[PDB]
Amino acid sequence: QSCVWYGECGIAYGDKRYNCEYSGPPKPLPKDGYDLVQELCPGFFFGNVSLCCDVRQLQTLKDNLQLPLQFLSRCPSCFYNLLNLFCELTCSPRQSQFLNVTATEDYVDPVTNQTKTNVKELQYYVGQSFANAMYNACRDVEAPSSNDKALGLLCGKDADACNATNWIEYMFNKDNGQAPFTITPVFSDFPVHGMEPMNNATKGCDESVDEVTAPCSCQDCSIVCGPKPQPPPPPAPWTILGLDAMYVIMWITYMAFLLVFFGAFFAVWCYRKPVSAAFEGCLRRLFTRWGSFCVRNPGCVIFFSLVFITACSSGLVFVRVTTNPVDLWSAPSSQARLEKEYFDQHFGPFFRTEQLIIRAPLTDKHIYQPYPSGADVPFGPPLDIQILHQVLDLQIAIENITASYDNETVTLQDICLAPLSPYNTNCTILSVLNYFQNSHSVLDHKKGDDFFVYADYHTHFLYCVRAPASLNDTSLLHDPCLGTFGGPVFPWLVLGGYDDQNYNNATALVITFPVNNYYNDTEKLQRAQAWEKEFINFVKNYKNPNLTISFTAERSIEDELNRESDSDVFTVVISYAIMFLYISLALGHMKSCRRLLVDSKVSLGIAGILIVLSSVACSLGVFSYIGLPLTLIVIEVIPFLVLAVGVDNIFILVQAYQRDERLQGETLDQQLGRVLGEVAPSMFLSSFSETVAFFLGALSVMPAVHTFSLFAGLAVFIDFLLQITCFVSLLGLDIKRQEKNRLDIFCCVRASESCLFRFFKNSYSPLLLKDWMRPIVIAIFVGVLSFSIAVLNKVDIGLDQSLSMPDDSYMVDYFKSISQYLHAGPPVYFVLEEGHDYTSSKGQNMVCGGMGCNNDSLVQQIFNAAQLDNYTRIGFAPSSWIDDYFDWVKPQSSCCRVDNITDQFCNASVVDPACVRCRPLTPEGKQRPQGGDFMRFLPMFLSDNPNPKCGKGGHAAYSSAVNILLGHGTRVGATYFMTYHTVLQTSADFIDALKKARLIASNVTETMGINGSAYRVFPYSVFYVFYEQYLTIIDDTIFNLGVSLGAIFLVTMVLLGCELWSAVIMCATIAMVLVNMFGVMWLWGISLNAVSLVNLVMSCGISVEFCSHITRAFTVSMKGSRVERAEEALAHMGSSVFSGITLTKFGGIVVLAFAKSQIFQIFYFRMYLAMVLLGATHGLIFLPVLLSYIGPSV
């Protein structure tokens, strides 16, 4: 061996210098540019160097290689062979093996008069196996600001016919502008002229160059990426013979029942052609004695009753109302609530978002044509220049807003979050205008001279949607697109309406204004909401006819529900008035026209209304005293429920007295005591059954059911007591009044056999209980039960969180805009808890996504999830901090540089006096920082800023994501890896997203193998607390309904004696009511949520109020046969139960039908209507027939 050239003495043109000929042996290097040889081509560095090379040649290599490093450095094995062809081509130590100079001539020096020899031309021997593996490993790499191939800008022609030999000829040719002299390549693998060429090792785009540099992407290499992922779809229908499972299995249960049931009637019809009274008797005696006591002592009883009312109802001064949604819809000690508590303590709370979905309806799409060559690229309507100026005008106006509070201004600049503050203090605005940095100048600046423009905002937009984190364009524009706050703006967060990667076609512009949320501070939250109100008002009062804005503020759902929570008081007041009107007119039997206003019950009706409203106030006041806060659900379900139960008892008592004839020699207090003693066990049964039912129903962890259960239980109990003591006293007084002839309301101016009872005794009970009507009735009811049980498991789960908004609202428009345009959803944070190591080889392999780290690690699993993206609802890649930290700390990048004496961070833009690199540029230094070096360089990384010489830095993105626990060697605390969900439109989507995020977290926790259960991975998103209840709502429904029905069963089997048969008939009928309630639920499209479960547990308690009365009247009766007992029970009790609860509630719902609110009209009106008429129908048409057939003897 020998060298061929050294130095630069000649000059061609510009800075280009001809190499100076010298064919002696290779020189030991002067120790000056040792750093350069390890960056350009490290294959020569095994020191005792003896390289023929020169630092003035090396620095011109590095200067000319600027654009191939930028384009081709994405795929390391490609840029590795390119470096191997140049370093070796220029200054290899065995240069004479593969080179032979042909033409050379002398050069004259103006400095020393010694004539130097330039090298004008020569020939270069290149192997064929190097060029084929080189071109084939580099042909797939894409270019920046285009979808072309990167060879298309470096071959000198189209990328369809640049062969594996002509491209090398174009590179060595001076026609490009870089090569100082043309070199003629000759390609041959075999020795010619006895001289054999160079053939070193080659690596393709799939093989990695070193054990720490990850392989090439499949965007830039066609041999790494194989079959796509695919999930397995389970649909799960049984579908036996063509239609559903329960739909067919029930219809065969029905045909089997109807044939085995009516074939026994037509089979036999053609064949024939003491402990109870001991507890039920002491109660009767007690109520009779106490009833007489109350009629002959009215003053003491009414006084003590009023004192009780006042003492209990004085607790309304401490009334608190809960309106904050997390405490309402999320259990205080649930799993999701504990995860939210852990996240708010270590990383601070999730921010508040104010979006704005602007759209341009008048403008049409236009075409953009690149000047040199390239296919046409169409741009959507909002991406016109005029529309962008108007949106920029709108954004600068939203930043203006001041919104004074407590005589001081509270600006956007004060409340929004600027991640890297105070250095840069602007704040996060996520708008497509941040690519141009919110400046009319930068947006309006074009580069060129007439008849065509070289660059334009189309070119800038196209460059920055592909790579939004660059700090200079470096190709004909030379502008950054980082954004005024500093840190990237991702195109899927700021655009919508495009088609899957093609951001050119965008139809909407999304503009987000993140605002800080504060953890245990209330003054700041009042400041933030004070700004949001004015933001809402401004956007509503913004005219701009070219644009259609769909906006939202963080407090807007709460504001819409508090604005919607009025406008129906005009319906509820008229509802109660019409109810009271019926109570006053229907209680009194008319029986004559000249005696109307004396046998009238107006005063007694007023007394009934005051006892019911008074009961409401006593319930509210006792639980207000105790400290239980109210809710807006309670305020709509409590008057109605208490009205239902209380009014029915009032009718039972008053009509049971009116239809009673007074015995001879019996005075009034004895008669009223007798009637109360004979009617009171049934009322006691109903009231006690509901109180025990509701109170026992206060065991769930659901806040709506918990507070409702407490309030409703106390109200039913207090209302029963208040009736039993005060209403019989007022009833005695009103009988005294009517017997002393005195007229009604004004003052002092001086048996019944009611119209309903003559219909129920004479026409309805005999007809219904005939032998040709009972099989028809039983057939119809088992058929309706069969339908309801069949369509049971097709009921929806959850609430749409939209139908809860008015129809004239802007939030409905915002939800339409989301569903029609948006592509990203709420962010997910995968929090790895405190306790992980991070300063060890295995501890880093379990968490990384990169080269040496595992294939089942955390970052890799979220990446796989994002490759699926429809089964698992995680839309995008993770954005880890540990990969970035490793990329930052590696010696090649050279962002890291420490001060020599102070051990302080020397910045990337600094004058360079003596600060040296942190990690040594040796083979050991290439590796990951596994020891104590990790924790010595991590805070400096998290404090580094986005410098143009370094890259992105770790302050704007990871400062809140990494917690460092100072003192005792400084370990790492809890950290997160944040990605984004897919657009979620319905409750099914939200539950699916929750479930599968939990699944990924549980998977990672399994693979990590923790000794015991010291820590675990968990996902946090904002809606998890609101949607975690629906993962156990089915077992909650089972437990609540089963426990309430068992409580009813037990209370019935205790109070009725020990008769198990009456209890089983009553319980089976209320279970029928619940199953048919679910059928009507499915049929009207009501969904199962936290409102519907409350309404079902209420229906289970009104079902008793019908049943209990009828079944007790049948049971305690001493007639002969079942038919006469059924018609007797029907007549006697059903005349009062149809007039008391049914007609009142029916009048209420039919007047309530003009409601004007959607939430009310779906979950309250329909459920109440269903409950009332279903229970009425069931009781009065199904207890007679079922008791007639299989009722309990005595």
Ligand SMILES: *[C@@H]1O[C@H](CO)[C@@H](O[C@@H]2O[C@H](CO)[C@@H](O)[C@H](O[C@@H]3O[C@H](CO)[C@@H](O)[C@H](O)[C@@H]3O)[C@H]2NC(C)=O)[C@H](O)[C@H]1NC(C)=O
């Ligand atoms: C979403 O945006 C993409 C942006 O590429 C649209 O694709 C392209 O469609 C436009 C429609 O008018 C074509 O002009 C583009 O190019 C054509 O380019 C070839 C190049 O060989 C020429 O020979 C043709 O004469 C023509 O000019 C076309 N570009 C590519 C790369 O396919 C896409 O249509 C759009 N989607 C919708 C729904 O509008």
Ligand SMILES: *[C@@H]1O[C@H](CO)[C@@H](O[C@H]2O[C@H](CO)[C@@H](O[C@H]3O[C@H](CO)[C@@H](O)[C@H](O)[C@@H]3O)[C@H](O)[C@H]2NC(C)=O)[C@H](O)[C@H]1NC(C)=O
């Ligand atoms: C994730 O989201 C969807 C499934 O959840 C996919 O989308 C869909 O788009 C429509 C339905 O809106 C359907 O495609 C129809 O039109 C195409 C035209 O080529 C037909 O081939 C197809 O038979 C349908 O009539 C599909 O149901 C679905 N995608 C397709 C192929 O259009 C979406 O693609 C999916 N993405 C991924 C990566 O899973």
Ligand SMILES: *[C@@H]1O[C@H](CO)[C@@H](O[C@@H]2O[C@H](CO)[C@@H](O)[C@H](O)[C@H]2NC(C)=O)[C@H](O)[C@H]1NC(C)=O
């Ligand atoms: C081309 O291949 C040769 C043959 O392997 C390489 O030469 C050796 O390089 C290693 C790397 O450090 C040295 O340890 C050996 O001592 C070298 N052997 C010799 C000179 O006989 C050479 O490095 C390759 N070219 C490049 C640029 O890597």
Ligand SMILES: *[C@@H]1O[C@H](CO)[C@@H](O[C@@H]2O[C@H](CO)[C@@H](O)[C@H](O)[C@H]2NC(C)=O)[C@H](O)[C@H]1NC(C)=O
């Ligand atoms: C956002 O921060 C940037 C710098 O972090 C501020 O800077 C400049 O904006 C002015 C016009 O206001 C331009 O003339 C300069 O070119 C920018 N300076 C640099 C060095 O980039 C900017 O004012 C801040 N505010 C807004 C609203 O953009």
Ligand SMILES: CC(C)CCC[C@@H](C)[C@H]1CC[C@H]2[C@@H]3CC=C4C[C@@H](O)CC[C@]4(C)[C@H]3CC[C@]12C
């Ligand atoms: C547009 C494309 C083709 C440009 C990429 C090729 C460039 C960067 C390459 C091709 C030929 C190379 C040159 C070949 C010869 C010499 C003389 C030597 O003493 C110093 C390096 C120097 C000056 C090289 C610098 C890099 C170089 C100019």
Ligand SMILES: *[C@@H]1O[C@H](CO)[C@@H](O)[C@H](O)[C@H]1NC(C)=O
């Ligand atoms: C280039 O690579 C392709 C696969 O991408 C292969 O089919 C072809 O044979 C290769 N050509 C060579 C090595 O000349």
Ligand SMILES: *[C@@H]1O[C@H](CO)[C@@H](O)[C@H](O)[C@H]1NC(C)=O
């Ligand atoms: C609104 O913002 C503009 C931005 O240039 C500023 O000049 C002006 O002072 C702001 N305040 C007003 C109008 O109160």
Ligand SMILES: *[C@@H]1O[C@H](CO)[C@@H](O)[C@H](O)[C@H]1NC(C)=O
């Ligand atoms: C606002 O508060 C300050 C006290 O900080 C007080 O001096 C000032 O008079 C107040 N202004 C008004 C208009 O109330």
Ligand SMILES: *[C@@H]1O[C@H](CO)[C@@H](O)[C@H](O)[C@H]1NC(C)=O
């Ligand atoms: C980005 O602009 C040019 C592009 O060639 C580059 O030379 C320059 O160094 C970069 N800017 C800074 C501040 O480093």
Ligand SMILES: *[C@@H]1O[C@H](CO)[C@@H](O)[C@H](O)[C@H]1NC(C)=O
């Ligand atoms: C609406 O668009 C037209 C055309 O781009 C423009 O002239 C006008 O100023 C725009 N703005 C309005 C009406 O506020």
Ligand SMILES: *[C@@H]1O[C@H](CO)[C@@H](O)[C@H](O)[C@H]1NC(C)=O
């Ligand atoms: C994942 O785990 C190891 C690491 O390479 C290996 O044994 C296993 O085959 C890998 N699985 C796949 C599918 O690559």
Ligand SMILES: *[C@@H]1O[C@H](CO)[C@@H](O)[C@H](O)[C@H]1NC(C)=O
């Ligand atoms: C770089 O460091 C110097 C000195 O510490 C400091 O003045 C300068 O603001 C830093 N620049 C950044 C962080 O962009």
Ligand SMILES: *[C@@H]1O[C@H](CO)[C@@H](O)[C@H](O)[C@H]1NC(C)=O
């Ligand atoms: C760093 O400090 C050591 C000893 O303090 C010294 O030997 C070395 O030359 C210094 N390097 C630089 C670049 O100042």
Ligand SMILES: *[C@@H]1O[C@H](CO)[C@@H](O)[C@H](O)[C@H]1NC(C)=O
């Ligand atoms: C979690 O792991 C199980 C087996 O360990 C696998 O079936 C399931 O698909 C994984 N879930 C993911 C990757 O979301």
